[PDB]
Design a protein around this ligand. Structure first.
Ligand SMILES: Nc1ncnc2c1ncn2[C@@H]1O[C@H](COP(=O)(O)O)[C@@H](O)[C@H]1O
Ligand SMILES: Nc1ncnc2c1ncn2[C@@H]1O[C@H](COP(=O)(O)O)[C@@H](O)[C@H]1O
Ligand SMILES: *Cc1c(COP(=O)(O)O)cnc(C)c1O
Ligand SMILES: *Cc1c(COP(=O)(O)O)cnc(C)c1O
Lengths: 823, 823
């Protein structure tokens, strides 16, 4: 009977057993054959050849956690922007070299097959690109960690630039399956909605609820070469399917067609304000996921080690729930509904355990953006929960009162219930009330979380508030995407560095060396060529490989400032034009990002970018000195390509608007010099790299605050700054739009008359700051020289570090660089 | 690339290797582990170790067929009562033994695992077992045959008796997945619907349609020990899901949630009338299947052997289409459709092909059941197909007029358009006009086919009419469900009988060797014993293994006659009670059937046996001399159980009603005597066996037609017989009802006043025949020698015969029982 084991069925590295398991998977798993198989089959055969390995490990790893009994740290997040798992599972799992050999024999090119893979559409942006690094670093630093989210079938829309206009093409990545997940019908749990609270003798009962079924999908995550593979668990909604007659509800009328569908689309789609479905999604994921946690808590050796009712008395010791942005906050009242209505812990016992079990990483800098739901929305689909949210609140305000008697305005400033045109619930005030630690995500950002935005709460409980600066994984953002540059670097100092990133600091020691100079600039050369090429096979252009590579690949939005960036390109265009032969450096200026559907200004801004695009790039006198490029359907595996070929990172937001910034870091480590303003974490990048080593410019927060105070008038800059005057008049004449000259009319007025973000305010400095970079480009030695200084600096930006810190101050778990044994 | 082979994954009989592979599937496929695996997970581990051995073979067979390029025979049928695939994958592959040594060692009882598997809920009755049966033999006699039907998600209902009442529960057999099927998302086809035939220049176009997509699953089907595994490909309907934006349809209104849901349920469930669902199911599977059929055609080197059109002239030579019943009849206007509209064959050529290519099989005894669809549905949804059923009709009544110049009534009798209040297409007439073979399913059924229902069709084309007689398969129905009798038989005459069951005649030589006489009977007593255990362990009662186990397991219906069998179990009961003391040959009557949703009489007859039971079964005076049990939810996995264990075979239909009856044949092979009326398959069975070895009885057909001519006054029968007068007043005063006495009224009155099937006429001679049934039982030597004279004579009843008659006479290929190497 123990006879059934993991101990002999993967003979791992051998390029013989790898051909064996591939050919096995192609024929028997995939129930296909070489006379029929397409690239996509051979790719699936390869993904299972690498997947057999991963679950060897994963069964061992998990089983390990059941004996050792660690604190389980459950990351809740409604986005998980992973994006391709073949290559990453090969470099982390060691297997990279063997896979290339097996396919080489087999007559298949491995690289052909990895670009076959669809970006795991489970995330949309950085809140979920973050969560993803957090998942790989946690497992690398051997913590019994677990990511939890919803499965999205349709991800989040795909971008298509039709007519140089944005059409969101749909992304059902999943319509051929996913060789890395494993459905689990066996662990299908109810998520309840609507219903009615009866108050009954031993508390209450939440009766006549509608029910939707949550059904899980484990996908496993390897850690860099240490054999710990942990469990990402995504849920899917599947309706009750009694739908024909069961309950004698149907028959009468099949408006249950709508139960089936509405419920079924709690999994269908990631969002891109108020909606019963966003909130449906948010109750869904956290009900299900808490049902799981109570279950490994009750059984993981605790059906054994009960002493106290397999009690939650020891729940915060053993289990750790982390809230990523406000979207999971319903974990706080659900655990309080679960703990008191379902078991029976007295209210206080329950709360003690909630505040001890949770934490909340904040990603919002401006307070209008904190999630807040209508009480008539809460009281309709989550009735018991609104009761719980009202009682927590009450108790919080009694505690505020003991601590500040008579500051009556405090009581209403701090409440969970917000009065107004519509009485609301403020979800961040729920989390701070309900976690034992609140951390922001940037030096600067957690400061203002203390000083202005959460200050009353920071005054009532100063302990709670912490910092935990955002970082990249060195694996995906340094080795996968920048292989040779990982190489030349390891040469000089070891292999501990991809798992101990500030050792990059030893490269300091090479700043003047004309070897690591041509070295580093060689891998960058390689990189800019591979990327030179992709652009006219996937998509078509005419680069000049020599040129500056001005990259900005950010969510398209007003505060992010691709508008000033195009103003500079129009400036340059016209400068190359009026001075037809003037030696200036070249710059391939590429802006990439998806808009946000039915947001007119971001849809227009891309129209600007792909309007300049035709004009200047089909101007003769430009030739190859100026190039503008919109990167269509910019996503994680397009980051990995393009960040490698970056020279100049653009980081132009308005100061005070970014709460951190992760694409930022990614450019610094791949030897991409940042331009940018003093915001979010473009600041700590400066604290190590050195202010000189960084093109930090324009307004800081003070001057915007001071310009908001003295009234900002855009006309006044237009009338002084002379090439500005010129290019706005160009935009209105319909220079960049002969067929509808009128077309860009609203970008003009936006700027001219009503701009919140002060683009023109930082124009002036920007053209002269960008002139600093184009003296320096063409001082190639010193150019590279600052690029090395940059990389050695990168180290504090590894998720390794952030997890290690979340590990140490909040979670209460020590990191670990040990390799687990086995297969 | 040729290194991508089937060659090396073949440990086959190696128990060492089979255990290593159960293990790979539990840890790396199912991604589960011994700490957390359940019995189900162990079943699914085993379903996969074997599937390696199935699909390895299917790859070699399918390649084979394209290397050789055989005529391929397509069997479209809407029903495939597949019923449980593991032990039957194992015995046709010889792995039965090595799987139990490998699981013995791993500490898992194989029969346990075996009972975890759900029946393939792919069917409903006689017609779906016969399809699967033919299928198994199509494979053993080397036919390049495919099975094509509809994949029901939720089957047909599971039958559950509530207090005596049939409540239908549902059969979502697919609730945990199905290991044998691989879904083929890659091969999605559209089926068109509604739309509008727009006519132009060359020909017509069906424009503006609704499109549903048919998505296929493949399940390999293994022929006994010859290593040929063929294909059953079921289609699952799936709505296009651009419904969210595309078309611009939704946004305006998502009442399109209905398209999706009406589309989905072309597959959501089987039937149990003039439903557009029914008709959308029948058409679905036809449009879907003919696409793969012209696809394989145009591929299977018929690109190569084009010479003229990739000529559909040569199409019947490499294709065959079998319309098992009226249901795939749209296969004839649809093959025409593709051929004249899409290709551009002229009508006459195409008709030559659709006629040389289809072959109808009929299962009816009577005129009334023939499928007939109102023109207004064919015109609503299937507009182009209505126009071709009309030119086909139009041309046909010309051949008929030319050949019967002047008989007008024959033209209105052969018409494919039934006339009256509502205008129908008689879909059986279609099939005879497009097929080139029309065939019964028994000698007399085929006879009333050329003498009554289609005699004018028999007069216009005598050559098309055939007979082919149903058969069981000795692999499932003897080897698999009763290895015991199959062991005592295999020693005396050899294993060669399983592929050639007329070698069972040799058993006659041992009629008087008294070892076999007690061997045969040892097995039946062991069988009945095993099943008596089931009756106390999946549900319960108090059995007696020695009693005459009497069985009837047919659908519950008035003509199939279990109410006769009730009146006789209540005759017999009364007798144990007038004189308790007179020994009476004890019986355990078991009647089991699924009634039919919303058939009141059938719902009523079941509630009688679960009543007749409660009374006699509890009454002390009986002991265990007679008991009654209704078998809950008859289905192939129970038939494999109860048919082994039966003595009596209740084949009591009214004479003239039944056309063949596969059930009949299952009983004989498993050594059970038959009691029954001289209808359909009681005829040929009694003929190979001798009427002395059979318990034929009752109103012959002649007899019934006389009683009909004089008017069956049932009352007179009531008034001559006392033991009946007795049991009639019994029901009515409420003896078997008592809490609601009047409860059986509509049965008493049915019987007395409107019994279409003359249940009282066959009372007398039947209960007398049962008195001579119980005589023999009380003489086991001779009982078992009439059982030897029975088993030995089954031969004619293997489906390998029926299929051979079919390969050779209709499809036009010769069988092959040859071993194909593999793997
Ligand atoms: N009681 C247990 N003892 C050992 N390993 C276990 C146990 N329960 C679960 N596991 C392992 O942990 C994995 C995750 O378990 P679960 O927490 O049930 O999702 C399983 O796939 C097993 O590999
Ligand atoms: N042209 C071919 N040559 C060899 N094998 C083939 C060919 N076409 C199909 N097959 C095999 O037959 C199987 C079933 O083919 P199909 O008839 O397309 O369902 C495929 O999976 C292959 O294993
Ligand atoms: C890292 C990353 C980003 C980062 O955006 P920032 O605003 O720079 O933090 C965006 N998209 C993808 C796909 C990424 O991997
Ligand atoms: C063989 C079989 C039948 C056939 O029914 P008859 O009326 O006996 O021909 C019905 N149900 C099941 C489960 C069978 O296997």
């Amino acid at each position: 009977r123990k006879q059934i084991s993991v101990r002999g069925l993967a003979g791992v590295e051998n390029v013989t057993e790898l051909k064996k398991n591939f050919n096995r998977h192609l024929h028997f798993t995939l129930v296909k054959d070489r006379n029929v198989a397409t690239p996509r089959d051979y790719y699936f055969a390869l993904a299972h050849t690498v997947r057999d390995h991963l679950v060897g490990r994963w069964i061992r790893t998990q089983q390990h956690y059941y004996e050792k009994d660690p604190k389980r740290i459950y990351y809740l997040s409604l986005e998980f922007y992973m994006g391709r798992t073949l290559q990453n599972t090969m470099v982390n799992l060691a297997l990279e070299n063997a896979c290339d050999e097996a396919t080489y024999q087999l007559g298949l090119d491995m690289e052909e097959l990895e670009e076959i893979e669809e970006d795991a559409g489970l995330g949309n942006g950085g809140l979920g690109r973050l969560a993803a690094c957090f998942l790989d670093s946690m497992a690398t630093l051997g913590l019994a960690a677990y990511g939890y989210g919803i499965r999205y079938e349709f991800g989040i829309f795909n971008q298509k630039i039709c007519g140089g206009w944005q059409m969101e093409e749909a992304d059902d990545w999943l319509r051929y399956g996913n060789p890395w997940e494993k459905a689990r019908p066996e662990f299908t749990l109810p998520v309840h909605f609507y219903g009615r609270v009866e108050h009954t003798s031993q508390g209450a009962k939440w009766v006549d609820t509608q029910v939707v079924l949550a059904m899980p999908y484990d996908t496993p995550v390897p850690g860099y070469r240490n054999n710990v593979v942990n469990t990402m668990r995504l849920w899917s909604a599947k309706a009750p399917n009694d739908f024909n007659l069961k309950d004698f509800n149907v028959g009468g009328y099949i408006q249950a067609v709508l139960d089936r569908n509405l419920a079924e689309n709690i999994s269908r789609v990631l969002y891109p304000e108020g909606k019963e479905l966003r909130l449906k999604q948010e109750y869904f994921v956290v009900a299900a996921t808490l049902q799981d946690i109570i279950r490994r808590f009750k059984s993981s050796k605790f059906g054994c080690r009960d002493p106290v009712r397999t009690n939650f008395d020891a729940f915060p010791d053993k289990v750790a729930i982390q809230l990523n942005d406000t979207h999971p906050s319903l974990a706080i009242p659900e655990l309080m509904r679960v703990l008191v209505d379902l078991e029976r812990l007295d209210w206080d016992k329950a709360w003690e355990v909630t505040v001890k079990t949770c934490a909340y990483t904040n990603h919002t800098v401006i307070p209008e953006a904190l999630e807040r739901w209508p009480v008539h929305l809460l009281e309709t689909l989550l009735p018991r929960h609104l009761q719980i949210i009202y009682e927590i609140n009450q108790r919080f305000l009694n505690r505020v009162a003991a601590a500040f008697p008579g500051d009556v305005d405090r009581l209403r400033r701090m409440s969970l219930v917000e009065e107004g045109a519509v009485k609301r619930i403020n979800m961040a005030h729920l989390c701070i009330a309900g976690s034992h630690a609140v951390n922001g995500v940037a030096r600067i950002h957690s400061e203002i979380l203390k000083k202005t935005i959460f200050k009353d709460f920071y005054e009532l409980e100063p302990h709670k508030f912490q910092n935990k600066t955002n970082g990249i994984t060195p694996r995906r953002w340094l080795v996968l995407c920048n292989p040779g540059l990982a190489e030349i670097i390891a040469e000089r100092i070891g292999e501990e560095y991809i798992s101990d990133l500030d050792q990059l600091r030893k490269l300091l020691s090479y700043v003047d060396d004309e070897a690591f100079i041509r070295d580093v600039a060689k891998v960058k050369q390689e990189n800019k060529l591979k990327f030179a090429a992709y652009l006219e096979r996937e998509y078509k252009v005419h680069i000049n490989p020599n040129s500056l590579f001005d990259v900005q690949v950010k969510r398209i939005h007003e505060y992010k400032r691709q508008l000033l960036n195009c103003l500079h390109v129009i400036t340059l265009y016209n400068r190359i034009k009026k001075e037809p032969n003037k030696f200036v450096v070249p710059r391939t200026v590429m802006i990439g990002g998806k808009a946000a559907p039915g947001y007119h200004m971001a849809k227009m801004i891309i129209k600007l970018i792909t309007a300049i695009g035709d004009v200047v790039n089909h101007d003769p006198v430009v030739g190859d000195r100026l190039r503008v490029i919109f990167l269509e359907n910019y996503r994680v595996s397009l980051a990995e390509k393009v960040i490698p070929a970056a020279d100049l990172s653009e980081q132009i937001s308005t100061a005070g608007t970014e709460a951190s910034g992760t694409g930022n870091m990614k450019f610094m480590l791949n030897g991409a010099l940042t331009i940018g303003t003093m915001d979010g974490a473009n600041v700590e990048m400066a604290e190590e790299a050195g202010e000189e080593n960084f093109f930090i410019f324009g307004m800081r927060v003070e001057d915007v605050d001071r310009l908001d105070q003295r009234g900002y008038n855009a006309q006044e800059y237009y009338d002084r700054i002379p090439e500005l005057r010129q290019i706005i008049e160009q935009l209105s004449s319909g220079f960049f739009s002969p067929k509808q000259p009128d077309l860009f009319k609203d970008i003009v007025n936006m700027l001219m008359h009503h701009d919140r973000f002060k683009v023109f305010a930082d124009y002036e400095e920007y053209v002269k700051c960008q002139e600093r970079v184009s003296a320096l480009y063409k001082n190639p030695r010193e150019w590279t020289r600052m690029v090395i200084r940059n990389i050695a600096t990168s180290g504090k930006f590894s998720s390794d570090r952030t997890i290690a810190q979340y590990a140490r101050e909040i979670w209460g778990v020590e990191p670990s660089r040990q390799r687990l044994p086995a297969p």
